[PDB]
Design a binder for this molecule. Structure first.
Ligand SMILES: NC(=O)c1ccc[n+]([C@@H]2O[C@H](COP(=O)([O-])OP(=O)(O)OC[C@H]3O[C@@H](n4cnc5c(N)ncnc54)[C@H](O)[C@@H]3O)[C@@H](O)[C@H]2O)c1
Ligand SMILES: NC(=O)c1ccc[n+]([C@@H]2O[C@H](COP(=O)([O-])OP(=O)(O)OC[C@H]3O[C@@H](n4cnc5c(N)ncnc54)[C@H](O)[C@@H]3O)[C@@H](O)[C@H]2O)c1
Lengths: 296, 299
């Protein structure tokens, strides 16, 4: 049967990709986005899609939309982050908007809630390697992590049946971060710093299809959505130059560290979501780069 | 001879008592209150006082008030809490409003920032007794604790020279929340009161206000448990109220059983280290002061 799904931040990387999967299998999708960072083009028209331009900080709007629709699931991807000095929109969107969305879902007995969270909730340098789901919380390292983490608090407090995907880095088409930086600089002929660190990168499309399973009732609570492996920043850079189809090899500026590696332990995710086949790094980066070429 | 101090929640229990201390010594005080819980009558007029009705959620107002004053210090007492289901105001006041206040202070190079935090940052049933300052943070037990602790996080993150007083319960005149105003009202209406079999810390607002002035003046850095390190049974608080009201006979309370800890002590050690050995006002004196306020101002 046709599910009803409310998606916040539906014109963003993660939300638009989820929206596409749901719409293609016949679900009814209602979405909200204010275009802080998302783009209208990310979300193609579909007869079962309703799009509302607005902010999740708008309490009456969020309640009206969820109240009317009575969704089977809320997928909450909306987040403010782009300017680290903009504490105002970070709190207004992630705290006021985030609790608005959580409480509306709880008020309307929404059966499933999917949230997305930064691994910065554990601090910038974890005390566990790999980081386990019981790593102490240390979110006061940025406006983004602090506010994102207060939104998670409200979700855990609400009593909703939820799934939170805690993520290192999500990359692909529609994506900020190292990928667009690398692409942008190499396009301008600029030399890139490549630090001697390993980090975890996850294709948005792997995450989108694990979300559909969460919408369908797979999983409860917080998970590390990770392969359990990490990649060197050099390997990421190399993948970007490879997809860019350069007459080059431009040797980067190797830069010493100033954590060396952040592995997220995926044991609970393997347990409940099964052994997932994660898209290979080159293919993930190829898709991200084809998107940059076409848009920016 | 005249510090400039900006107070948020200036018409509340804690803010107004701090304003009074600063004004009587010759300081210049500017304050803001939306009357979500406090009262205009809590803040008496004074030549060196400027009062502004408004919300700290208003980014432009906060930045204009602090921007125009260039305070030596910000005392941030404003908080939303009174309706546990009102997540919107809690996050708009505590998170948006609270981050506004912290960031405006930092942008304006404010030398000292004093904040007030709930010991619910630690959870409802702590795993240390006495609770130490390194106790794990478990704030996801109420809208109040979650949004207060986000505000605390921004303060820590800002780079400001701050003191946070972490508190159990603050009581005395102008206390509008918690058991004390409820005991007074129900006792004066002849209604049955409920006493839980639990022990909690209660601190006289005026002790806290005098420590805040020291903190404004440069005493302490970081987080502290503002506490004697003792606690009292709720039954003792109730009995102190009956005796302060001089009721002609003792009204037997209804005893509730205690999820939650039987007793929460906060370790005062770092407070003694940096603020010295504070003579805490005894409960009897604290409750008599509160009862005197409730008889004049009502609940
Ligand atoms: N590396 C990553 O991209 C990554 C890693 C960890 C966590 N996450 C989380 O995943 C979620 C989505 O991430 P993304 O990569 O798709 O980011 P994104 O910027 O592509 O999408 C977020 C969307 O939210 C919208 N939005 C912002 N404020 C809004 C508001 N007040 N009301 C309505 N819409 C608003 C934006 O315009 C944007 O479309 C976020 O919660 C983010 O914190 C992402
Ligand atoms: N009172 C306690 O037992 C206790 C215990 C732990 C922590 N604290 C903290 O101490 C601080 C002060 O507590 P109190 O006992 O003085 O409470 P209070 O309610 O008397 O004071 C809070 C004041 O802030 C004002 N306020 C609320 N939202 C505002 C907004 N958006 N803009 C401007 N003003 C606003 C209220 O009207 C009120 O006057 C609060 O931050 C509280 O969380 C108090």
């Amino acid at each position: 049967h046709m599910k009803k799904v409310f998606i916040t931040g539906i014109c963003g990387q993660i939300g638009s990709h989820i929206a596409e999967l749901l719409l293609e299998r016949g679900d009814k999708v209602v979405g909200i986005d204010n275009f802080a960072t998302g783009r209208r083009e990310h979300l193609k028209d579909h007869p079962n899609l309703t799009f509302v331009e607005g902010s999740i900080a708008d309490h009456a709007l969020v309640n009206q939309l969820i109240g009317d629709l009575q969704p089977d699931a809320v997928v909450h991807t909306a987040a403010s982050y782009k300017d680290p000095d903009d504490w105002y929109n970070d709190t207004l969107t992630n705290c006021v908007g985030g609790s608005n969305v959580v409480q509306a879902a709880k008020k309307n007995n929404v059966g499933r809630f999917v949230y997305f969270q930064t691994a910065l909730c554990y601090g910038v340098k974890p005390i566990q390697q790999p980081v386990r789901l019981d790593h102490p919380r240390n979110p006061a390292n940025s406006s983004y992590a602090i506010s994102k983490s207060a939104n998670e608090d409200y979700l855990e407090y609400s009593g909703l049946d939820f799934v939170t995907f805690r993520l290192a880095n999500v990359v692909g088409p529609r994506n900020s971060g190292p990928l667009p930086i690398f692409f942008q600089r190499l396009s301008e002929g600029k030399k890139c710093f490549v630090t001697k660190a390993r980090r975890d990168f996850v294709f948005v499309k792997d995450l989108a299809r694990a979300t559909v399973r969460a919408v369908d009732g797979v999983g409860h609570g917080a998970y590390h959505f990770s392969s359990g492996t990490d990649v060197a920043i050099k390997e990421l850079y190399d993948a970007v130059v490879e997809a860019m189809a350069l007459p080059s090899y431009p040797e980067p500026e190797i830069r010493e560290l100033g954590a060396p590696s952040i592995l997220l332990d995926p044991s609970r995710t393997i347990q409940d979501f099964g052994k997932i086949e994660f898209t290979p790094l080159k293919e993930t980066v190829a898709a991200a780069v084809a998107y940059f070429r076409e848009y920016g």
